[PDB]
A paper describes a structure:
The structural and zinc-binding properties of PA4063, one of the periplasmic proteins expressed by Pseudomonas aeruginosa under zinc-deficient conditions, are presented. PA4063 has a noncanonical ferredoxin-like fold. Two zinc-binding sites with micromolar affinity are exposed and are located on the same face of the structure. Two histidine-rich loops, which are disordered in the apoprotein, contribute to zinc coordination in one of the sites. These findings strongly suggest a role for PA4063 in zinc trafficking, possibly acting as a metal chaperone or as a regulator of a transport system.
The structure of PA4063 in complex with zinc was solved by soaking crystals in zinc acetate solution since crystallization did not occur in presence of zinc. Later, a higher resolution (2.85 Å) data set was collected from a zinc-soaked tetragonal crystal, confirming the positions of the two zinc-binding sites and allowing a better determination of the complex geometry and coordination distances. Site a is located on the flat surface of the β-sheet in correspondence with the histidine residues. The same mode of binding is detected in all three monomers of the hexagonal crystal: besides His124 and His126, the zinc ion binds to Glu87, likely as a monodentate ligand, and a water molecule, adopting a tetrahedral coordination geometry. The water molecule is not visible in the tetragonal crystal, where zinc appears to be coordinated by only three ligands. Comparison with the apo structure shows that coordination requires rearrangement of the donor side chains, which move closer to the site, while Glu35 is displaced. Site b is about 20 Å from site a, on the edge of the β-sheet where the His-rich sequences are inserted. Notably, a few residues belonging to these sequences, which are disordered in apo PA4063, become structured and take part in zinc coordination, although some variability is present. As for site a, the coordination is tetrahedral and three donor groups are provided by one glutamate, Glu47, and two histidines, His16 and His18. The fourth donor was modelled as a water molecule in monomer A of the hexagonal crystal, while in monomers B and C, as well as in the tetragonal crystal, the electron-density map indicates His120 to be the donor.
Author numbering: 15 to 93, 119 to 179
Amino acid sequence: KHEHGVAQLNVALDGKTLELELDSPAMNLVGFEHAASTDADKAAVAKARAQLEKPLELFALPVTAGCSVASQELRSPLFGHADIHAHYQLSCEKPELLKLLTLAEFFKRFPATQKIQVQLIGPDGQKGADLAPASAELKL
Ligand SMILES: [Zn+2]
Ligand SMILES: [Zn+2]
């Protein structure tokens, strides 16, 4: 799907491993999808790329759970419709303390995003949910 204002989040939590795949039209992240001609356009892309480099902050992961970034890919053309793909593998020393997942911070920092669609998979099974700025929590 490429619906402006909607992003997909796949989440896989197995023991100490946390895996996060975000797919999004750029419209909700930089505010356009045209090539980055100008240099008030180039700044807008650098800002986005920077917030996407700090997943512990953007996904508001508890510090209690001792989560570390193992690895991180950010593919996009901007790095005539355009997507942005972000992939993160994370290692958490105390995953028992990963109770909830808030996209509150995400909606804060990319407010042109109206909805995120979450797949979660753990050893417990598969969970699905539309998150909105109102309703932005999911129980793991
Ligand atoms: Zn588009
Ligand atoms: Zn990927």
